[PDB]
From a paper:
Entry of SARS-CoV-2 into host cells is mediated by the trimeric S glycoprotein that consists of two subunits: S1 and S2. The S1 subunit binds the host angiotensin-converting enzyme 2 (ACE2) receptor and the S2 subunit accomplishes membrane fusion. The N-terminal domain (NTD) and the receptor-binding domain (RBD), within the S1 subunit, are the major targets of neutralizing antibodies. Here, we identified a SARS-CoV-2 neutralizing human monoclonal antibody, 87G7, with a remarkable broad-spectrum neutralization and protection efficacy.
To understand the structural basis for 87G7-mediated neutralization of SARS-CoV-2, we performed cryo-electron microscopy (cryo-EM) analysis on the 6P-stabilized SARS-CoV-2 S trimer in complex with the 87G7 Fab fragment. Three-dimensional (3D) classification of the data revealed that the S ectodomains had all three RBDs in the open conformation with the 87G7 Fab fragment bound to the flexible, convex tip of the receptor-binding ridge (RBR). Subsequent 3D refinement produced a density map with a global resolution of 2.9 Å. Due to the conformational dynamics of the RBD and the flexible nature of the RBR, the epitope-paratope region was poorly resolved. To improve the interpretation of the 87G7 binding site, focused refinement was performed on the Fab-RBD region of the density map, which improved the local resolution sufficiently to approximate the positions of bulky sidechains which make up the majority of the epitope-paratope interface. Consistent with our BLI data, the 87G7 epitope overlapped with the ACE2 binding site, preventing receptor engagement through steric hindrance. The 87G7 core epitope appeared to consist of residues Y421, L455, F456, F486 and Y489, which formed a hydrophobic patch on the RBD. The interaction between 87G7 and the RBR was primarily mediated by the CDR H2-3 and CDR L1 and L3 loops, which formed a hydrophobic interface. Of note, RBD residues F486 and Y489 inserted into a hydrophobic cleft formed by the sidechains of CDR H2-3 residues Y59 and Y103, Y104 and CDR L3 residues F92 and W94. The 87G7 core epitope residues Y421, L455, F456, F486 and Y489 are highly conserved among SARS-CoV-2 variants.
Numbering used by the authors:
A (entry chain L): 1 to 107
B (entry chain H): 1 to 120
C (entry chain A): 358 to 553
The structure:
């Protein structure tokens, strides 16, 4: 029905140079996307509330970009919270299959 | 509501049923439409159920053709869980959560949830 | 707008309009040419998204409500609406579209209140949890944000059809000089002579 492709799993590198997320879904969308941050042993929470816009309780370290078929971000500052797992989620298509995320291997 | 009541877990053998709940009190059920998602240690996430905030239509999942039974009531604003013929696919974490006040998605804050373990 | 006499330099010297900027042609070098038809549209949006009313750009109002053609030489004029449009208690008469079938074409008006389908199921009147009402209102409050403050945006366009022209500048005139050798100019004649 709706396919979420979450990276070619080659971005697990050093946290320098401000690596982004290559979540791709080349089909119809209304630019209604939300993103999740998960640490192991911790329940995930939201990042953006409509599209490319930080909600209350988070600073401007995350800023989305993209519409229609592609979506990404630009991270601002390195942080101990950067060593975690990001999720890609879509809101329409009520069967509502979600993303899978990716790993980061520190070098 | 800023908080939510923490649910419970179960250690039911396969072929049985699960009966837990995650119900808040003093909260308007019409706004912040509920949603259930599985935190799979592995493949990822998939949405389970979503019922109308005023009492009405509910939707089954693509992999759920009525296997996860949805019998929810609006007079007490019941938030429950019931299924049949328990399988090894259920080795995940149950999450009770809700999206924004509109029917379409506008941001969903999630709960801590409880894990459920399958062992035959 | 037709058979008109319009002044354009008073808008630049009004000193109360925030966005006096557009594309195509400057209004200073606009009154030296004759035009035959003037179009005007009026709509209200909020603060910080007034940039994407231009061809070749994305957005929500630009892609689903109102857009411009690629050969758009007209001008856009916007100003604040802190007093009239915004009041206490909210105003639910200002709404913006969310849903339509495909990419917008330039210069059409849609009053399609029919709810837009998303899945393969039929809608059939009452909301079936995917077939949404495409219009959402605005919450007007006097202590709103800068980007959430409503703005009054008026766009205008110019064209040149085979019909005769209506507005040129009207470019005004000078005083009258008599009994001197002057270069007299008029509606359709030029020449050098003395007027008595």
């Amino acid at each position: 029905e709706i396919v979420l492709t979450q990276s070619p799993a080659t971005l697990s590198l050093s946290p320098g140079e401000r690596a982004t997320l290559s979540c791709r879904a080349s089909q119809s969308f209304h630019n209604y996307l939300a993103w999740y941050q998960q640490k192991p042993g911790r329940a995930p929470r939201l990042l953006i509330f409509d599209a490319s816009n930080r909600a209350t309780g988070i600073p401007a370290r995350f800023s989305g970009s993209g519409s229609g078929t592609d979506f990404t971000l630009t991270i601002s500052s390195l942080e101990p919270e950067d060593f975690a797992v990001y999720y890609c989620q879509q809101r329409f298509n009520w069967p509502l299959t979600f993303g899978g995320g990716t790993k980061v291997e520190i070098k | 509501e800023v908080q939510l009541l923490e649910s419970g877990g179960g250690l039911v053998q396969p072929g049985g049923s699960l009966r837990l709940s995650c119900v808040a009190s003093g909260f308007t059920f019409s706004s912040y439409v509920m949603s259930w998602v599985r935190q799979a240690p592995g493949k990822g996430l998939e949405w389970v159920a979503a019922i109308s905030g005023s009492g009405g239509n509910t939707y089954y999942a693509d992999s759920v053709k009525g296997r996860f039974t949805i019998s929810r009531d609006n007079s007490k604003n019941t938030l429950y869980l019931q299924m049949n013929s328990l399988r090894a696919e259920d080795t995940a974490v149950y999450y009770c959560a809700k999206e924004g006040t509109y029917y379409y998605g506008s941001g969903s804050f999630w709960g801590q949830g409880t894990l459920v373990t399958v062992s035959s | 707008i037709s058979n008109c006499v319009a002044d354009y330099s008073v808008l630049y010297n009004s000193a109360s309009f925030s966005t006096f900027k557009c594309y195509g042609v400057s209004p200073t070098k606009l009154n030296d040419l004759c035009f035959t038809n003037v179009y005007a549209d009026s709509f209200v949006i909020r603060g910080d998204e007034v940039r994407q009313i231009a061809p070749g750009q994305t957005g929500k109002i630009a892609d689903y409500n109102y857009k411009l053609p690629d050969d758009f030489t007209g001008c856009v004029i916007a100003w604040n609406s802190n007093n009239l449009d915004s009041k206490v208690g909210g105003n639910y008469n200002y709404l913006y579209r969310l849903f339509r079938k495909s990419n917008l074409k330039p210069f059409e008006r849609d009053i399609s209140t029919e709810i837009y389908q998303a899945g393969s199921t039929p809608c059939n009147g009452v909301e079936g949890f995917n077939c949404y009402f495409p219009l959402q209102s605005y919450g007007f409050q006097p202590t709103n944000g800068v980007g959430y403050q409503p703005y009054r945006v008026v766009v205008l366009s110019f064209e040149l059809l085979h019909a005769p022209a209506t507005v040129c500048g009207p470019k005004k005139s000078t005083n009258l000089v008599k009994n001197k050798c002057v270069n007299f100019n008029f509606n359709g004649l030029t020449g050098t002579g003395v007027l008595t």
